[PDB]
Amino acid sequence: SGFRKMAFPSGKVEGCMVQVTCGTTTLNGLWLDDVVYCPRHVICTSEDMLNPNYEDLLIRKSNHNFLVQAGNVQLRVIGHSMQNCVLKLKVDTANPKTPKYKFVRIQPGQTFSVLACYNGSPSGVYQCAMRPNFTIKGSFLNGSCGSVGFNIDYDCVSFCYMHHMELPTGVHAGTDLEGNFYGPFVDRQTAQAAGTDTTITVNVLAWLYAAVINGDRWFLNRFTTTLNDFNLVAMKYNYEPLTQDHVDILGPLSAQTGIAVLDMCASLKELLQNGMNGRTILGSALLEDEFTPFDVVRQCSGVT
Amino acid sequence: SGFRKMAFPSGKVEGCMVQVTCGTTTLNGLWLDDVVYCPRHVICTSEDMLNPNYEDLLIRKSNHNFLVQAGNVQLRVIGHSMQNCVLKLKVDTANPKTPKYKFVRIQPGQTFSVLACYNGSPSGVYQCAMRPNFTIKGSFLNGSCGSVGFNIDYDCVSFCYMHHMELPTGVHAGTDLEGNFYGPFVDRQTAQAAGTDTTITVNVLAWLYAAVINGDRWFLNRFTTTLNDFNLVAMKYNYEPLTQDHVDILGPLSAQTGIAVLDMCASLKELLQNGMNGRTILGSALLEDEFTPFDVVRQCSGVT
Ligand SMILES: COc1ccccc1OCCNC(=O)c1cncc2ccccc12
Numbered sequence: 001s002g003f004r005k006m007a008f009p010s011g012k013v014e015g016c017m018v019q020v021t022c023g024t025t026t027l028n029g030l031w032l033d034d035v036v037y038c039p040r041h042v043i044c045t046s047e048d049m050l051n052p053n054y055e056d057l058l059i060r061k062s063n064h065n066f067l068v069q070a071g072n073v074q075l076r077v078i079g080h081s082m083q084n085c086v087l088k089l090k091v092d093t094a095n096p097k098t099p100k101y102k103f104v105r106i107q108p109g110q111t112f113s114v115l116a117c118y119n120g121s122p123s124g125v126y127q128c129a130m131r132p133n134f135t136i137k138g139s140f141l142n143g144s145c146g147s148v149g150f151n152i153d154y155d156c157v158s159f160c161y162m163h164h165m166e167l168p169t170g171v172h173a174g175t176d177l178e179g180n181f182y183g184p185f186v187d188r189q190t191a192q193a194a195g196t197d198t199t200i201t202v203n204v205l206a207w208l209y210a211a212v213i214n215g216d217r218w219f220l221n222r223f224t225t226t227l228n229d230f231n232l233v234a235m236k237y238n239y240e241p242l243t244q245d246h247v248d249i250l251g252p253l254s255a256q257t258g259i260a261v262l263d264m265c266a267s268l269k270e271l272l273q274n275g276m277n278g279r280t281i282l283g284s285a286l287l288e289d290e291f292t293p294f295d296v297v298r299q300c301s302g303v304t
Numbered sequence: 305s306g307f308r309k310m311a312f313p314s315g316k317v318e319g320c321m322v323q324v325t326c327g328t329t330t331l332n333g334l335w336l337d338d339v340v341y342c343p344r345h346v347i348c349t350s351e352d353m354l355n356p357n358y359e360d361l362l363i364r365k366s367n368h369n370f371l372v373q374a375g376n377v378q379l380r381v382i383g384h385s386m387q388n389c390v391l392k393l394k395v396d397t398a399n400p401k402t403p404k405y406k407f408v409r410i411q412p413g414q415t416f417s418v419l420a421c422y423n424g425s426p427s428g429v430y431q432c433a434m435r436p437n438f439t440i441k442g443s444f445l446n447g448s449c450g451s452v453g454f455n456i457d458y459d460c461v462s463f464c465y466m467h468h469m470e471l472p473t474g475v476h477a478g479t480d481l482e483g484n485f486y487g488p489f490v491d492r493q494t495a496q497a498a499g500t501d502t503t504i505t506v507n508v509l510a511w512l513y514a515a516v517i518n519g520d521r522w523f524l525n526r527f528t529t530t531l532n533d534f535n536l537v538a539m540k541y542n543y544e545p546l547t548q549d550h551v552d553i554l555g556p557l558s559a560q561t562g563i564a565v566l567d568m569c570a571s572l573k574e575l576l577q578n579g580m581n582g583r584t585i586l587g588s589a590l591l592e593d594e595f596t597p598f599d600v601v602r603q604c605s606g607v608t
Pocket residue numbers: 041049140141142143144145164165166186187188189190305
């Protein structure tokens with residue numbers, strides 16, 4: 001028992017981390033096979049950042065200007081190309097530590113592990129969610145660009161995120177591994193509206209099921225609700241509307257606990273309307289939305 | 305910016321994880337050099353667990369009875385010995401992936417990363433603290449025994465914990481890597497008093513400094529206090545007494561923020577006496593005590 005914000009083991013990803021330097025800027029790259037992927041803003045200086053013309057800036061750079069270092073050894077760059085907001089540096093050596101991997105575009109509300117890196121060196125690993133507004137509430141400092149988010153299924157690493165910038169609001173924005181930003185964000189130093197965020201309702205319900213599995217049951221009540229009634233409450237409290245697809249994804253947890261999804265919705269409705277009254281659930285004094293139903297079952301079943 | 309419950313990258317530790325089977329019991333072992341370390345209860349059946357005579361049970365076992373598998377390959381056991389509550393299985397092959405490492409006994413209130421494992425395979429990594437009462441609030445299921453806790457300084461892994469059991473209360477107990485239990489716990493299936501836990505005051509203060517560094521400042525007030533006055537409040541709220549050694553450890557964060565330690569104590573006193581009033585600090589609705597002053601500076605400085 002016990003329920004923690006558990007990240008995937010970061011080993012397979014640590015072996016892919018490299019340092020990429022261009023001019024005076026250094027950030028992290030992801031070395032998979034004979035390609036190094038990094039944020040395209042590695043080619044910017046500081047006068048550039050307000051509105052960079054990436055095409056023009058990249059034209060001034062040659063393969064030899066991209067310094068790629070994997071631990072203590074230098075990689076030879078034999079090609080460079082820009083795909084959306086990422087640079088793809090072809091190197092002459094395939095990474096011997098390349099795990100089985102895929103590039104995936106995650107959906108808002110899904111979770112992933114982030115391996116925070118500086119100068120191509122891993123400093124820490126944490127679990128987070130892609131917010132409904134396509135920002136991530138990460139922990140990143142100067143030099144963390146190129147740090148990636150991922151999920152792992154047995155031996156396959158599904159890379160879903162590459163860190164690009166921190167918005168003036170202190171939340172983080174980045175791309176999928178094809179360089180497409182999640183959300184409306186652009187790789188420019190300008191004020192960018194993140195847009196209204198909501199709480200990931202299906203995740204809160206999954207976490208409420210995790211609480212019951214792990215002994216915390218004080219919030220269970222004698223009530224039930226309908227999807228429509230629950231969604232009126234979800235709207236008032238800036239929660240995402242619950243759909244039957246979400247009820248269906250919660251099926252396994254409902255069967256495990258014997259608590260119907262709509263019955264758990266009525267518990268959540270009561271917690272939203274009455275608060276926690278100074279109590280806690282799984283060591284938290286607020287409703288947690290960074291665990292998916294899959295994460296709850298994975299953590300409660302011990303999938304390696 | 306941003307502040308997360310960040311774990312150390314688990315790669316160096318993943319490379320040490322093996323599966324140890326003895327009779328019908330399978331758990332995890334830690335393979336460092338030519339030694340595999342695992343909990344001694346691997347030799348117990350089920351009738352044994354209520355009060356095992358470990359010496360007698362081990363006498364019936366021979367080197368060939370300990371099956372040690374590292375991924376897909378079998379390790380040859382050439383020696384076995386019991387040191388406190390751990391078994392040390394000498395193998396004929398030194399682990400090629402052995403990182404630089406030390407075995408350390410952590411102090412209560414200190415933090416560490418746990419790599420949860422099942423069948424010698426890593427499933428996840430999370431950060432936690434050794435509670436003042438020498439339990440850990442982990443996330444462990446059947447088969448997680450032998451999973452370890454550690455800290456990493458540059459290239460050196462300091463192993464501090466090996467998981468042994470879950471108490472009837474749902475909290476976890478284990479040993480240092482010499483097999484000495486943290487706390488009064490014994491490796492028997494009996495009810496064991498964990499003893500009164502307290503909140504790690506120096507850690508809450510460190511986390512309050514992290515909040516200020518990351519923009520959350522609503523809790524800063526116009527007050528100050530003395531160590532004696534603060535400790536009367538800490539006693540009432542089951543917080544550990546703050547000592548000058550704790551004030552000294554908070555020195556760097558006090559200099560960084562320009563907020564005197566006793567001034568931050570007065571903020572903490574007010575939060576303890578008035579609660580949060582429905583507000584949050586670093587995404588938490590309670591006072592967090594699982595970040596040490598060293599962790600706060602490490603996360604806020606990007607040490608790799
Ligand atoms: C506004 O910056 C950019 C805009 C567009 C494109 C790139 C921008 O950044 C480039 C450098 N950024 C970082 O290294 C950074 C990343 N995350 C967290 C941080 C926290 C404090 C200081 C810096 C960072």
